[PDB]
């Protein structure tokens, strides 16, 4: 590895363990804040379009319901999420404003990317082409070169997390599933197609799932659907543990190549994991078009600019039911979520 890359990953370490070890708490509170718009729904929490109302600034926030966290036992998770987020800096992950909690919920503002899910282009165009493929799988190949060198783990690689910004690159979402891993860790999580068959398997896992949850992305950017695709997870879980795989006649001799050895079942041989680490995937034919050094530094032309009208426009999300954000009279869970 080329020393300019070591001196770089060296710094992005020192910077993120400085932030790690000294985590910023209580940056904002609610009432700064004008609510606009739902832009997703889950089971313990929210995503609201929002506006700063002193600076105008728009912010997408992501809203927790702390007893909700505790009944999913979603707290460790949590509070990895806000303390990874608030520490790392990179050019392809969204980027954590503010966070505060209150008597019910947890709070994290992070910067609005109106251009909205890859998911929702990937399913509107179809398929990708393997450039504009391969443009979004460079970026992910950086992002994952630069969290495992901090010792994290990802683990909810999908289409839905990567939103795409005014500039066509994309932004990595959601970290309630990243992790600090020195080793091994053990906890099921992420959604079923993308899981690695060491998971599934309920083993110790390590980094080498991010690997093969790339290798489902670009098989499912290049082909439009998922490589393990059936009806349920069981079935999902069968077809990943198996070692087999159908590719579209239309992908490249070299594509095939490159999904083969991420999507190796056997994880002491899948590419990422092996003793020359992610430039076994850098230096692959699929990517010898690719140049590392400008996707980094966002000089490359994007495949696709979405459409939107201005920072505040949520046409490229979706419509849901918009509900209360109420805050009890009473504090909920402070001793579980202290720290936050
Ligand atoms: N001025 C020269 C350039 O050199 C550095 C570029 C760079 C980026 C990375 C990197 C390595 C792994 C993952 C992601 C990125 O390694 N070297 C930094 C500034 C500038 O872009
Ligand atoms: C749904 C949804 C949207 C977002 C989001 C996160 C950061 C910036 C913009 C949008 O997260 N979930």
């Known amino acids: 590895e080329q020393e300019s890359v070591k001196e770089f990953l060296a710094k992005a370490k020192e910077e993120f363990l400085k932030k790690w070890e000294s985590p910023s708490q209580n ?12 832009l997703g729904t889950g089971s313990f929490g929210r995503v609201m379009l929002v506006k700063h109302k002193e600076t105008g600034n728009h912010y997408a926030m992501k809203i927790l319901d702390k007893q909700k966290v505790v009944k999913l036992k979603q707290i460790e998770h949590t509070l990895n999420e806000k303390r990874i987020l608030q520490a790392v800096n990179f050019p ?49 190949v950086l992002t994952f070169e630069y969290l495992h060198s901090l010792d994290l783990i990802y683990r909810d690689l999908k289409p839905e997390n990567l939103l795409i910004d005014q500039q066509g690159y994309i932004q990595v979402t959601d970290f309630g599933f990243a992790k600090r891993v020195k080793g091994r860790t053990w906890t099921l999580c992420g959604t079923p197609e993308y899981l690695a068959p060491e998971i599934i398997l309920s083993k110790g ?15 499912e950017m290049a082909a439009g659907y998922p490589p393990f695709f059936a009806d349920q997870p069981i079935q999902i879980y069968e077809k990943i543990v198996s070692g087999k795989v159908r590719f579209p006649s239309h992908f490249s001799s070299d594509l095939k190549d490159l999904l083969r050895n991420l999507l190796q079942v056997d994880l002491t041989k899948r590419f990422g994991n092996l003793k020359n680490g992610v430039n076994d995937i850098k230096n692959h034919k699929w990517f010898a078009t690719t140049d590392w050094i400008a996707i980094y530094q966002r000089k490359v032309e994007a495949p696709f600019i979405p459409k939107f009208k201005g920072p505040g426009d949520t046409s490229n999300f979706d419509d849901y039911e918009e509900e209360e954000i109420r805050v009890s009279i009473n504090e909920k869970c402070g001793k579980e979520f202290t720290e936050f």
């Open 92 to 140: 392809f992950l969204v980027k954590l404003e503010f966070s505060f909690k209150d008597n019910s919920n947890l709070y994290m503002v992070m910067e609005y990317v109106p251009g909205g899910e890859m998911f929702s282009h990937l399913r509107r165009i179809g398929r990708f082409s393997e450039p504009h493929a391969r443009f979004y799988a460079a970026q992910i």
């Open 27 to 38: 940056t904002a509170q609610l009432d700064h804040f004008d609510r606009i718009k739902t």
């Open 205 to 219: 896992y390590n980094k080498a799932v991010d690997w093969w949850a790339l290798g489902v992305l670009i098989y």
